[PDB]
Amino acid sequence: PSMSITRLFPALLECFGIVLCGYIAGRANVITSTQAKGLGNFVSRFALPALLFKNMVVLNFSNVDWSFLYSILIAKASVFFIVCVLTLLVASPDSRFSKAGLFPIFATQSNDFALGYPIVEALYQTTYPEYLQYIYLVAPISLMMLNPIGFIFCEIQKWKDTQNASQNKIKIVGLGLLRVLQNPIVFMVFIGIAFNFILDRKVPVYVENFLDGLGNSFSGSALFYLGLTMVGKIKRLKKSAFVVLILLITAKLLVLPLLCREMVELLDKGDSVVNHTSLSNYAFLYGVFPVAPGVAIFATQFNMEVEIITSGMVISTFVSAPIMYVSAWLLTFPTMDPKPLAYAIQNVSFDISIVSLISLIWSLAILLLSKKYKQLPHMLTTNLLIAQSIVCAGMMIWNFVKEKNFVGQILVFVLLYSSLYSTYLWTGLLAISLFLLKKRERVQIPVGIIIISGWGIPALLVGVLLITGKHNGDSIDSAFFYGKEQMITTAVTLFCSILIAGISLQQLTRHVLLCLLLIIGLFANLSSCLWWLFNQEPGRLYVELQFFCAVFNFGQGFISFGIFGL
């Protein structure tokens, strides 16, 4: 029904493929600054102002509800106040104000022009078109209110750095207001409002085509420039920097969306509860948008804490996408029939599987071209990577052959679950290898025996499950292919693997990092299995468990890519 979600994934792929192409183009010393600077000038001075002006001429203020605006603005203000007061309380008075001048802006100003707008357009085109007009009401008005406080704090920092007592508060406030008014967004929004008042909701044809041509390329050009502006800005930092960065990113992506949603339910008191639900979903989706590079521009202008802000913007840009996907899907689950839940879990499984598959072949190609697998413990890691690649490929093939052929279906199921159980064991097997390496014992490692074990017990388990189990082909999900017996064998496999990892627990640090991260997902799957078997009656909690289990099962390659990929 409402909230057509199938269009979200292609939009995310488009929006990140453009950024990736821009990044790699600059990376390979192909594009130089000259045209890149020209591209940035075109985006900032011509394309974005044209888009704002054309979308601001046609607004139809007479039927625009302001409850959403109040909710979003006050929630942003609440996060702003919380972060600002915490920064004032915590930061050392040496340069505390500087922090308070930029840090709370990081959690409030988003990239809702270049990134968020395509996403909401894909999500809300044929369902709620009017939501699209809210972005241009939310992004500038916030810049009206919250950011001038940041500028005046930065100016206080600059003044105390200069130690010039002659300057009064009037000068500082004036400089801050001059800085905030100088931005193109402010005065172009004002000009748009003035022209909307003047022309009585009419667009000149002589310039309408010019405005459309200038504004249509803005999204892509801005995405390409953003990709170009991330080539060499991420650098190693200290532990305190890492901690404060994690807190900032969690404030942006975890606190603000929840406050926005809750205040949306609080303020709004209209009927037709479906529209209230849609507004809440839209507010939460708007909360999770990334951080715009405008804050990085401000920091560079002020020449203070530039590297922290830049690195945070870069990292949050990438972190936004998976959170966006999982958030959209999990909010969409409650208003769905169980069979659509099965189809949805198949869709998310296929999507994560293809992306993780690309990551996995990239990592495997790097590893094989390294020729570093011939010594311990890299060959076992290669085996695990191959098992993950095969499970992803089997997931895609199973998605295609869910109701295509019979013998093909059983062979695909056998291959997929043999690879799945192979990864389940190979976690604990790597744990054993690491533990025996910890012993520092000059004893030969049965490499042939250990590999044949790791690749032979899972196949034997699947085979005995097939022999003893009963075929049940009416279940969409692959877990319920055979029934209780498959759940029992998966549960005992998980329990054995977790026991092995717990008893057990040269780049050993990365290996132990992987041999710690995989096991949280191991407990997740085990808990889901025992939840299903013990709780025969369905409670209102296993849906998120199923979604998380599917995510881990088919995207576990991302952990290996992150650790053993650079």
CB closer to ligand CLR, 74 vs 326: 326
21 belongs to the binding site for ligand CLR (CB under 6 A): no
* Nearby residues of 104 by Cβ (< 8 Å), 6 or more positions away: 79, 80, 83, 84, 87, 150
Residue 247 is a binding residue for ligand CLR (CB under 6 A): no
Each residue 354-383 as x (binds ligand CLR by CB under 6 A) or -, in order, gives xx--xx--x---------------------
Decide if 476 contacts 338 (C-beta within 8 A).
no
Q: Collect contacts of 381-386 with beta carbons under 8 A, ≥24 apart.
A: 381/430, 381/511, 381/514, 381/560, 381/564, 383/422, 383/426, 383/451, 383/454, 383/455, 384/423, 384/426, 384/427, 384/430, 384/560, 385/360, 385/557, 385/560, 385/564
Nearer to ligand CLR, 112 or 351 (CB): 351
Asked if residues 227 and 39 have their Cβ atoms less than 8 Å apart, the reply is no
Q: Does 559 bind ligand CLR (CB under 6 A)?
A: yes
Total residues at interface with ligand CLR (CB under 6 A): 39
CB of 507 to ligand CLR, least distance (A): 10
> According to CB under 6 A, which one of 13, 69, 487, 545 is a site residue for ligand CLR?
13
CA-to-CA distance for 391 and 395, rounded, in angstroms?
6
What is the distance of C-alpha 21 from the center of its chain? 18
Residues 425, 454 contacting (CB under 8 angstroms)? yes
Instruction: Answer yes or no: is 469 a known binding residue.
Output: no
27 sits near ligand CLR (criterion: CB under 6 A): yes
Between 215 and 555, whose beta carbon lies closer to ligand CLR?
555
The three-state secondary structure class of 94 is: coil
Does an H or E element contain 194, and which? Answer: helix 184-199
Beta-bridge partners for 291: 110
Among 88, 231, 326, 512, binds ligand CLR (CB under 6 A): 326
Q: Does 524 bind ligand CLR (CB under 6 A)?
A: no
By CB under 6 A, tell whether 122 contacts ligand CLR: no
Burial of 566 (0-12, 13-18, 19+ CB in 10 A): exposed
The footprint of ligand CLR on residues 336-355 (CB under 6 A) is: 351-352, 354-355
482 neighbors 468 (Cβ within 8 angstroms): no
Question: At its nearest, how many Å lie between ligand CLR and the CB of residue 333?
Answer: 9
Which residue among 64, 246, 274, 365 contacts ligand CLR (CB under 6 A)? 246
Please check if 23 is assigned to a binding site: yes
Specify whether the CB–CB gap between 308 and 241 falls below 8 A. Answer: yes
Candidates 132, 323, 451, 491: give the one binding ligand CLR (CB under 6 A): 323
Determine if 260 is a binding residue for ligand CLR (CB under 6 A): no
Question: Which of 325, 413, 424, 481 touches ligand CLR by CB under 6 A?
Answer: 325
When asked if residue 461 is in the footprint of ligand CLR (CB under 6 A), the reply is no
Residue 461 near residue 493, CB atoms below 8 Å: yes
Q: Which two tokens stand for residue 416?
A: 């997929």
Our finding on whether 274 is near ligand CLR (CB under 6 A) is no
Among 77, 247, 451, 517, binds ligand CLR (CB under 6 A): 517
**Residue 9 counted as an annotated binding residue:** yes
How far apart CA 158 and CA 298 sit, in angstroms, is 14
Read off the amino acid at residue 458. P
Q: Is 343 annotated as a binding residue?
A: no
* Residues at the contact surface with ligand CLR, assessed by CB under 6 A: 12-13, 16, 20, 24, 27, 234, 242, 245-246, 249, 254, 315, 318-319, 321-323, 325-327, 330-331, 334, 351-352, 354-355, 358-359, 362, 517, 551-552, 555, 558-559, 562-563
